[PDB]
Design a protein around this motif. Structure first.
Motif, PDB file in Angstrom:
ATOM      1  N   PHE A   1     -20.321  47.491  75.407  1.00  0.00           N
ATOM      2  CA  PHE A   1     -19.798  48.853  75.377  1.00  0.00           C
ATOM      3  C   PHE A   1     -20.731  49.825  76.085  1.00  0.00           C
ATOM      4  O   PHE A   1     -20.275  50.695  76.834  1.00  0.00           O
ATOM      5  N   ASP A   2     -22.038  49.699  75.860  1.00  0.00           N
ATOM      6  CA  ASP A   2     -23.012  50.648  76.396  1.00  0.00           C
ATOM      7  C   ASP A   2     -23.420  50.232  77.810  1.00  0.00           C
ATOM      8  O   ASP A   2     -24.554  49.842  78.084  1.00  0.00           O
ATOM      9  N   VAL A   3     -22.457  50.341  78.723  1.00  0.00           N
ATOM     10  CA  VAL A   3     -22.701  50.053  80.130  1.00  0.00           C
ATOM     11  C   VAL A   3     -23.714  51.056  80.660  1.00  0.00           C
ATOM     12  O   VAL A   3     -23.419  52.249  80.782  1.00  0.00           O
ATOM     13  N   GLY A   4     -24.906  50.576  80.988  1.00  0.00           N
ATOM     14  CA  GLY A   4     -26.007  51.442  81.351  1.00  0.00           C
ATOM     15  C   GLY A   4     -27.301  50.883  80.809  1.00  0.00           C
ATOM     16  O   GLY A   4     -28.391  51.222  81.278  1.00  0.00           O
ATOM     17  N   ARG A   5     -27.182  50.016  79.809  1.00  0.00           N
ATOM     18  CA  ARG A   5     -28.302  49.247  79.291  1.00  0.00           C
ATOM     19  C   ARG A   5     -28.109  47.746  79.422  1.00  0.00           C
ATOM     20  O   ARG A   5     -29.099  47.019  79.512  1.00  0.00           O
TER      21      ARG A   5
ATOM     22  N   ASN B   1     -14.975  52.943  64.025  1.00  0.00           N
ATOM     23  CA  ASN B   1     -14.319  52.537  65.261  1.00  0.00           C
ATOM     24  C   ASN B   1     -13.493  51.288  64.991  1.00  0.00           C
ATOM     25  O   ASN B   1     -14.037  50.255  64.583  1.00  0.00           O
TER      26      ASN B   1
ATOM     27  N   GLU C   1      -5.067  41.945  72.158  1.00  0.00           N
ATOM     28  CA  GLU C   1      -4.880  41.138  73.356  1.00  0.00           C
ATOM     29  C   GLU C   1      -6.106  41.262  74.257  1.00  0.00           C
ATOM     30  O   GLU C   1      -7.077  41.948  73.930  1.00  0.00           O
ATOM     31  N   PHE C   2      -6.050  40.588  75.408  1.00  0.00           N
ATOM     32  CA  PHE C   2      -7.174  40.629  76.343  1.00  0.00           C
ATOM     33  C   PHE C   2      -7.519  42.036  76.810  1.00  0.00           C
ATOM     34  O   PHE C   2      -8.710  42.392  76.786  1.00  0.00           O
TER      35      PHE C   2
ATOM     36  N   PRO D   1      -7.759  47.428  73.495  1.00  0.00           N
ATOM     37  CA  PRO D   1      -7.430  48.856  73.490  1.00  0.00           C
ATOM     38  C   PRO D   1      -8.649  49.712  73.178  1.00  0.00           C
ATOM     39  O   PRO D   1      -9.708  49.232  72.773  1.00  0.00           O
ATOM     40  N   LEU D   2      -8.476  51.008  73.390  1.00  0.00           N
ATOM     41  CA  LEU D   2      -9.552  51.955  73.152  1.00  0.00           C
ATOM     42  C   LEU D   2      -9.903  51.981  71.669  1.00  0.00           C
ATOM     43  O   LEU D   2      -9.001  52.036  70.822  1.00  0.00           O
ATOM     44  N   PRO D   3     -11.180  51.941  71.312  1.00  0.00           N
ATOM     45  CA  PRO D   3     -11.552  51.947  69.891  1.00  0.00           C
ATOM     46  C   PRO D   3     -11.328  53.299  69.240  1.00  0.00           C
ATOM     47  O   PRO D   3     -12.267  54.089  69.103  1.00  0.00           O
ATOM     48  N   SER D   4     -10.089  53.576  68.841  1.00  0.00           N
ATOM     49  CA  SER D   4      -9.788  54.829  68.164  1.00  0.00           C
ATOM     50  C   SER D   4     -10.566  54.926  66.859  1.00  0.00           C
ATOM     51  O   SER D   4     -10.784  53.927  66.168  1.00  0.00           O
ATOM     52  N   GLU D   5     -10.987  56.138  66.524  1.00  0.00           N
ATOM     53  CA  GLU D   5     -11.879  56.371  65.398  1.00  0.00           C
ATOM     54  C   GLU D   5     -11.105  56.887  64.193  1.00  0.00           C
ATOM     55  O   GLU D   5     -10.239  57.757  64.319  1.00  0.00           O
TER      56      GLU D   5
ATOM     57  N   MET E   1     -33.964  59.638  62.507  1.00  0.00           N
ATOM     58  CA  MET E   1     -33.331  58.716  63.440  1.00  0.00           C
ATOM     59  C   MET E   1     -32.949  59.374  64.758  1.00  0.00           C
ATOM     60  O   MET E   1     -33.250  58.835  65.827  1.00  0.00           O
ATOM     61  N   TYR E   2     -32.290  60.531  64.711  1.00  0.00           N
ATOM     62  CA  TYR E   2     -31.858  61.230  65.913  1.00  0.00           C
ATOM     63  C   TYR E   2     -32.468  62.615  66.070  1.00  0.00           C
ATOM     64  O   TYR E   2     -32.224  63.267  67.092  1.00  0.00           O
TER      65      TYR E   2
END
Ligand SMILES: [Zn+2]
Lengths: 433, 568, 193, 195
Positions: A49-53, A284, A296-297, A300-304, A356-357
């Motif tokens: 999911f975290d495209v960038g790491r 999520n 399915e393959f 879908p978008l992980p609706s919250e 944490m943040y």
């Protein structure tokens, strides 16, 4: 001696093959893994999911893996029969390795897990074999038959099921250099599917064959709180999980109730929830619409979805029988409960796990403000019934003194002169407290 | 080896670190026009660098002279150079006048870094050992041949490099013999650049249906002259198609669905965009197997069509409007009535892509359309440069044809492909009727001196198309032994020929032990050796090594010396 | 036959509504633009009809004189849907086909191709004056004055007034055409050489 | 002059898209710019709020300005969440509203056409509903709303006009006709009322 005795392999947020070649091994918070048969063998594909790491990759597979587990530093593959496990870190500095598990008669790997300190492999017999990151074994232990596994950065959570001991969970934090235990084989309140498995289901038979226990996922929280999702469609959090004596299993979300109250009124069954992760009211989950529970393959978008206590009463909710209306008397009380539990959870990680943040203190302060606002609304509601003792009892839980002054104003305005003196006495006591 | 399969991601990351700056455009991609494989590879690279917002420049280069001129013009700021489809068979540092001491920065500490990196990316196997082994600036995207089949050459090169009595001199000659036998080898092609870049993308994880389609196009570009390579690479594409196709099969067709399919794709010529009769008639393989060039061939074709029970009116109908009864029974009819004529190899499996409601198209047809757009899309040393300019311009027509939004250009490409195949057929029947091919004991010469539309053959791609037609015709003749062929075509305006030394090939679908060993095109070394002596105004600049431009008067002495030359 | 006719009509209606090449519903837009300028027709390309659903094209090319009126009915229904606010008197739209099939020479049209769709070329040598073919034929019984209506498709199979009073006997041919309530269309005879 | 003729008193559709692109939209980030407790360059923009951009957490929905959501969606670094009105159920509800009330327009957002076009072009794989159906319902809404407009342009008086609930692109395309026919019917009236 059948049905639940089948310790068929399970990985978090798994998927059956169904009527196609696509199967989802795992859906962690950091990505998902899919397998497709090339008419003779499987080709694994791992996405993040975290495209960038991380960067997604797909590789040819000959052993036909059945188990997977994704961490923030590497993913581990497993096999059900002749369970040769394979561990592959994402970074190229660490070299991937494969190992062959000791397999006995009737043995089959049920779940696999990994942790930057140790890697843990399950076993239908009930073995707790563990290795290091590089494959060298560390210890072999036998426990109740493990059926599922999910691990955070340094802590491991597992659920053990057996036909004689029942569903028993165990939360063990391996730690960098201290194997501090927090639970061991303790009973858990998850409802196993028994009535729904009595040959009365449509399209659920295949999924129940894929996972006999019907537990969809064991994902953690952003603060390390274990969570459980399954047939009952209710989250199960561990509020005071630090102290074993303070064990608390709180149902924080009610999927069916929330779906109904957002669907317009129908008790829709065509909406199924596939949870991925939870992080401070942010659940999520893919909401598949149709007769097939698994997605399915094209995932879908992980609706919250937001967490909601099962305090919603049907009798009160059907006031406007058919934007479902919510009873304001109970809505504020539910908001009070949510703020209470969230504050309690945040306080546990405040002093222990630290910041944490950088915004946990501010969100905690805002949550406490809402917590006292809910108390003020409930105080006004009690005063509306001219029940001075009710408002007096509810006023003793107020945190901010400014909210207590607002309660004084409510008492002096809501036709309750007698409440003025008692709330003022509470405020004067708080002067010295 | 320089860059293996498993370390393409290292090269990509090095490129990203060196030139992924949004401030300027420090990346330049040199692409060889008149090469469909290089075109698809450069399209892949363009899409990949568009995803990562890496500013880049794409330059179509026709010949080595243009490459040298552009490199001389190249600024020193550009610190990443990609050579797609060429550069792997020549001493690039020597050709471009490159000395590593003037391109090295921060030499220190056992490491070295350079201010400009040249990544050569091609498939011609005579890797120059001074490039694959003895240069750090030049970085070659190997496909696994060097790390497995160049151990002896590696040892021979390194021993001579390090060593700068009787035993020492004898061993040097023994090693130098190993290097020499490595050279004097014909230039072949083992892999497709599109497949290599798709492997890199699989390493990076950017694979998708469009990239897979470009890979299929690049690979299918090799099926005409290197069918062994295409058959080697086909299972990988077959697996990738299954992997990437969504599980929601048998669904209703919607105006947005893009479907890669593996369905029977008969080895005819533009079957879906022309009549069935014209697909058989203009097919290279059918012509070879039936000899349609002579008068009796058309009678054989009509007899075949009558045998299958397909009326000539239906056979000559456009494929879209052919009656659904016949069009749905093509597989059964071809099964029943093709082995009789020896055309059993016509039946084949290929890739067919349908974009919503726009109708099917196969990779074989798509590459023919792209090739047609490359060929005819739009005193002596100046008009030739005008031809090079037009040839470079056609590269962008073929590039824009790839985009799904320019189908009105792909249809024009299809029409041009049909016209060019018609012209090729006419010139082939003209050559085979007058018996223009002079049989020899070294090479079957054939010179085009006069005729119609002779200006089509100054383009190397069209000349290679005609040569492939002739070679396919000759390959199916058992009496004619295998022998290299030479085609020439006089350019009246420039008074120059275009000699294109070709290579023979075994009949398609014939798999034997000698078929497994590929045929090597030896004309490059012969041409270079003949030109080095006896100055004859020869222009050896094509990336296709076995193609030269020779003066009209100097052609005959050149061919005489080539006959005297035993190199090939 | 009602079920099959309705199915064909619905299929070609869905062809009109759903067909689009790239982000633009070609035939919806064309139908609306034609209605705006009072051009009650629709020029339907045949490659598009083949690409959408080849079964529809097979049905059309099998028996054109029976399917084309259904397609005109579907066009009329779509026109009412996309140009009239729900809650008429709109003429039956005309279907104009465009094909790229191989041209059949005018002398090659023989016993076969009868009732088929043929594309051919020639030079016009004569054009008749406009006739008047009836479409809506308001009709009244001669004796019992039983007024009814008849709708004409103008695609001759290979219709006449009813030979019955159709609701005392009223005779064998009791119907006279009411010409002040009928609706006609203009028809022209050409001559191709 | 400085401003071209076709830009005199109207907005080119590109300018309408530019205006729409400044509206906030909700996205699911594929990156994480939230600095941990344990360098990096922050956005610090001047025409919007950078707070929600420096605190992106992967797969945690935030709200960013649309022209930035598209910029991230150019890579694979976000995932635009379709607005609630852009679902098949809501589009069917709006179509039913239009078919039920033939005198007034439905309450679609002012940027529904522009947003639908932009999301269909740049975020075609982020819809929980099949895009081939969303397009077919957007077109149906456009057709019904065009029928109602042509039957109200039949009320072009010289005093005023109430085009309630009309979108922005529809108004923009009808501006040069309505605002130039009403001008003429006003000039005629004022010429008559010269007494
Ligand atoms: Zn009568």
């Amino acid at each position: 001696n059948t049905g639940k005795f089948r310790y068929m392999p399970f990985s978090p947020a798994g998927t059956p093959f169904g009527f196609t070649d696509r199967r989802y091994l795992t859906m962690n918070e950091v990505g998902y893994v899919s397998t497709v048969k090339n008419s003779e063998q499987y080709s694994i594909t791992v996405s993040f999911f975290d495209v960038g790491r991380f960067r997604e990759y797909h590789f040819e597979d000959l052993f036909g893996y059945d188990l997977c587990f994704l961490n923030e530093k590497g993913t581990l593959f497993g096999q059900s029969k002749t369970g040769q496990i394979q561990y592959r870190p994402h970074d190229s500095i660490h070299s991937n390795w494969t190992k062959i598990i000791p397999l006995q008669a009737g043995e089959r790997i049920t779940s696999v897990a990994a942790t930057p300190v140790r890697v843990i492999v399950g076993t239908s017999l009930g073995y707790f074999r563990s290795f290091n990151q590089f494959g060298v074994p560390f210890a072999v232990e036998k426990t109740s038959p493990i059926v599922a596994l999910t691990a955070q950065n340094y802590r491991v959570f597992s659920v053990h099921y057996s036909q004689f001991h029942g569903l028993s969970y165990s939360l063990s934090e391996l730690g960098t250099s201290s194997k501090r235990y927090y639970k061991r084989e303790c009973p858990l309140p998850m409802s196993l599917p028994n009535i729904n498995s009595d040959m009365k289901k449509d399209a659920n038979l295949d999924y129940y064959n894929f996972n006999p226990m019907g537990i969809k996922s064991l994902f953690f929280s952003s603060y390390g709180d274990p969570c459980i999702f399954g047939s009952d469609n209710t989250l199960l959090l561990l509020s005071k999980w630090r102290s074993p004596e303070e064990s608390k299993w709180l149902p924080i979300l009610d999927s069916n109730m929330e779906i109904w109250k957002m669907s317009g009124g129908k008790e829709t069954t065509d909406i199924h929830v596939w949870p991925l992760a939870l992080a401070y009211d942010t659940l999520n989950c893919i909401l598949v619409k149709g007769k097939h529970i698994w997605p399915e393959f094209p995932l879908p978008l992980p609706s919250e979805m937001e967490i909601r206590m099962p305090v919603f009463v049907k009798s009160k909710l059907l006031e406007e029988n058919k934007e479902i209306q919510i009873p304001v008397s109970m809505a504020a009380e539910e908001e009070y409960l949510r703020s209470k539990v969230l504050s309690e959870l945040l306080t546990d990680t405040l002093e222990n796990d630290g910041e944490m943040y950088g915004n946990e203190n501010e969100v905690l302060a805002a949550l406490n403000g809402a917590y006292d606002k809910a108390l003020l609304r409930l105080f006004a509601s009690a005063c509306s019934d001219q029940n001075v003792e009710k408002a007096l009892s509810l006023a003793h839980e107020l945190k901010q003194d400014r909210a207590l002054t607002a309660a004084v104003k409510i008492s002096e305005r809501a036709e309750l002169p007698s409440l003025v003196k008692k709330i003022n006495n509470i405020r004067e006591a708080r002067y010295e407290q | 080896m320089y860059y293996g399969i498993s370390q393409f991601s290292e090269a990509y990351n090095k490129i990203l670190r060196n030139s992924s700056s949004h401030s300027s455009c420090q990346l330049v991609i040199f692409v060889s026009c008149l090469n469909i494989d290089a075109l698809c590879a450069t399209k892949m690279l363009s899409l990949l660098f568009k995803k990562q917002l890496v500013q880049s420049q794409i330059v179509p280069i026709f010949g080595y002279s243009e490459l040298r001129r552009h490199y001389s013009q190249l600024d020193d700021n550009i610190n990443s150079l990609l050579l797609v489809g060429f550069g792997g068979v020549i001493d690039l540092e020597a050709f471009l006048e490159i000395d590593p001491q003037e391109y090295v920065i921060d030499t220190d500490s056992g490491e070295q870094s350079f201010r400009r990196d040249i990544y050569v990316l091609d498939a011609h196997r005579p890797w120059n050992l001074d490039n694959i082994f003895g240069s750090q600036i030049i970085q070659c995207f190997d496909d696994g041949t060097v790390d497995d089949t160049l151990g002896e050459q590696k040892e021979a090169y390194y021993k001579l490099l390090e060593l700068d009595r009787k035993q020492r001199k004898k061993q040097i000659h023994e090693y130098e013999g190993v290097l020499e036998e490595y050279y004097s080898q014909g230039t072949t092609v083992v892999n497709s650049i599109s497949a290599q870049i798709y492997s890199l993308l699989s390493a990076i994880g950017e694979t998708n249906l469009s990239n897979l389609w470009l890979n299929i196009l690049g690979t299918t570009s090799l099926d005409i002259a290197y069918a062994q390579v295409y058959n080697r690479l086909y299972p990988l594409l077959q697996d990738e198609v299954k992997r990437l196709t969504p599980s929601s099969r048998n669904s209703v067709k919607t105006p947005d669905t893009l479907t890669l399919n593996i369905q029977p794709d008969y080895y005819l010529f533009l079957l879906r965009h022309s009549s069935l009769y014209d697909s058989f008639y203009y097919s290279n393989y059918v012509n070879a197997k039936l000899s349609l060039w002579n008068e009796n061939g058309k009678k054989r074709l009509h007899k075949m069509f009558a045998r299958m029970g397909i009326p000539l009116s239906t056979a000559q109908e456009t494929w879209l409007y052919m009656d659904h009864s016949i069009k749905r029974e093509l597989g059964i009819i071809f099964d029943k009535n093709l082995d009789r004529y020896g055309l059993q190899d016509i039946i084949r499996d290929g890739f067919v892509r349908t974009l919503g409601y726009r109708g099917s198209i196969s990779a074989s047809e798509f590459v023919e359309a792209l090739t047609a757009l490359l060929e005819v899309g739009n005193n002596s040393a100046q008009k030739l440069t005008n031809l090079r300019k037009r040839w470079v311009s056609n590269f962008w027509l073929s590039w824009d044809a790839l985009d799904d939004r320019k189908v009105e250009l792909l249809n024009r490409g299809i029409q041009l492909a049909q016209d060019l195949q018609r012209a090729i057929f006419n010139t082939g029947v003209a050559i085979l009727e007058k018996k223009l091919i002079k049989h020899l004991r070294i090479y079957r010469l054939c010179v085009l001196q006069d005729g119609p539309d002779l200006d089509l053959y100054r383009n190397p791609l069209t000349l290679l198309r005609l040569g492939n037609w002739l070679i396919e015709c000759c390959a199916e003749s058992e009496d004619k032994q295998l022998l290299p062929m030479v085609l020439a075509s006089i350019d009246e305006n420039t008074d120059t020929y275009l000699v294109a030394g070709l290579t023979p090939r075994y009949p398609r679908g014939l798999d034997t032990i000698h078929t497994k060993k590929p045929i090597l095109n030896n004309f490059s070394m012969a041409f270079q050796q003949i030109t080095a002596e006896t100055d004859a105004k020869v222009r050896i600049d094509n990336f296709e090594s076995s193609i030269i431009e020779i003066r009209r008067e100097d052609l005959s002495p050149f061919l005489e010396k080539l006959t005297l030359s035993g190199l090939l | 036959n009602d079920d099959d006719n309705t199915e064909i009509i619905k299929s070609f209606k869905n062809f009109i509504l759903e067909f689009r090449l790239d982000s633009q519903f070609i035939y919806r837009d064309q139908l609306r633009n034609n209605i705006l300028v009072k051009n009650y027709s629709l020029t339907v390309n045949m490659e598009h009809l083949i690409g959408y659903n080849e079964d529809i094209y097979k049905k059309l090319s099998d028996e054109p004189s029976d399917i084309i009126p259904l397609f005109e009915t579907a066009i009329t229904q779509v026109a009412k849907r996309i140009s009239i606010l729900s809650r008429n008197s709109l003429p039956t739209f005309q279907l104009i086909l465009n094909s790229n099939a191989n041209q059949i020479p005018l002398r090659d049209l023989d016993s076969e191709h009868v009732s088929k769709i043929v594309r051919l070329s020639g030079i016009i040598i004569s054009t008749s004056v406009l006739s008047s073919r009836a479409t809506y034929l308001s009709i009244m019984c001669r004796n019992c004055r039983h007024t009814t209506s008849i709708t004409i498709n103008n695609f001759n199979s290979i219709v006449s007034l009813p030979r019955s009073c159709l609701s005392k006997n009223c005779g064998p041919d009791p119907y006279i055409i009411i010409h002040e309530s009928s609706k006609f269309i203009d028809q022209q005879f050409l001559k191709l050489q | 002059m400085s401003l071209p003729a076709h830009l005199q008193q109207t907005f080119s559709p590109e300018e309408i898209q530019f205006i729409v692109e400044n509206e906030p939209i909700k996205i699911f980030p594929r990156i994480t710019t939230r600095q941990k407790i344990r360098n990096h360059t922050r956005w610090q923009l001047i025409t919007t709020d950078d707070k929600a951009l420096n605190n992106m957490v992967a797969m945690r929905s935030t709200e960013v300005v649309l022209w930035i959501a598209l910029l991230l969606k150019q890579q694979s670094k976000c995932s635009i969440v379709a607005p609630q009105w852009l679902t098949t159920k809501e589009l069917d509800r709006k179509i039913q509203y239009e078919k039920t009330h033939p005198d007034r327009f439905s309450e679609l957002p002012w940027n529904w056409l522009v947003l639908a076009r932009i999301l269909f072009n740049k975020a075609k794989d982020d819809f929980h509903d099949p895009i081939h159906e969303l397009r077919g319902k957007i077109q149906d809404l456009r057709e019904i709303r065009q029928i109602k407009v042509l039957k109200g342009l039949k009320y072009l008086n010289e005093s005023h006009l109430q085009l309630d609930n009309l979108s922005l692109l529809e108004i923009n395309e009808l501006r040069p006709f309505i605002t130039e026919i009403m001008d003429k019917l006003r000039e005629i009236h004022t010429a008559s009322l010269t007494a």
